[PDB]
Ligand binder design. Sequence first.
Ligand code: NA
Ligand code: NA
Length: 129
Amino acid sequence: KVFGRCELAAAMKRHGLDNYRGYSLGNWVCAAKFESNFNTQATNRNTDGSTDYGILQINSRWWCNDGRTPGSRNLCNIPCSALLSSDITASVNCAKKIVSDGNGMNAWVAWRNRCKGTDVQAWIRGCRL
Ligand code: NA
Ligand code: NA
């Protein structure tokens, strides 16, 4: 599924990401924009052979099992394909673990390079929330 900007904002807010570990909703929307263009089916290979999945490009190196990432973990206890669903629950619950793990949103390279330090509230302008 390709979410609309405000559509995703609303789903993310309903799932409890607005100020989760202090990251305002616009941080999450910004991250999703640059990780997946709001596309739940997005997949991209990493140099180390792991793969990033779904709307927040969650990595098979640590967080999910895709059956082909050797010496990896599955800290969210999910197949990686669950992160490609039109329903974002599994990505959101997994993101909550990731963001809590010490490095906050810096775990998302797109967030650190394109959102951090910017006026991320722009990402939710116009949205009924
Ligand atoms: Na990425
Ligand atoms: Na943090």
